[PDB]
């Protein structure tokens with residue numbers, strides 16, 4: 347069902363949370379080789395998550411599930427805020443700008459924390 351597809355999407359999201367925290371530890375420790383690898387892993391995970399989310403939103407639309415569509419339109423918008431911040435973070439890493447990397451990292455954490463009550467609301471709406 348769309349509900350089990352959302353649980354699968356939620357797990358991919360939690361995987362990115364896990365890798366992100368390991369990445370934050372590596373950044374603080376100065377292990378740039380590790381950070382580079384974790385950033386590649388996160389890019390792939392976010393690409394996957396975004397794709398599942400779109401398939402969930404399109405399915406909710408075809409199902410006429412107006413409330414789920416409303417919530418998923420909001421949630422995908424916020425996902426794109428996180429994605430833009432992540433991409434800027436990756437650029438800061440390429441550029442050697444640890445000040446910008448720190449800023450983007452904290453922002454990406456707060457955008458993720460904010461978007462969690464909605465993530466739970468979608469599970470219940472589908």
Ligand SMILES: O=C(O)c1cc2cc(Cl)sc2[nH]1
Pocket residue numbers: 389392393396424425426427428429430432433454457458
């Ligand atoms: O690159 C992406 O698509 C992407 C990165 C992040 C971080 C988030 Cl929280 S949501 C999100 N999406």
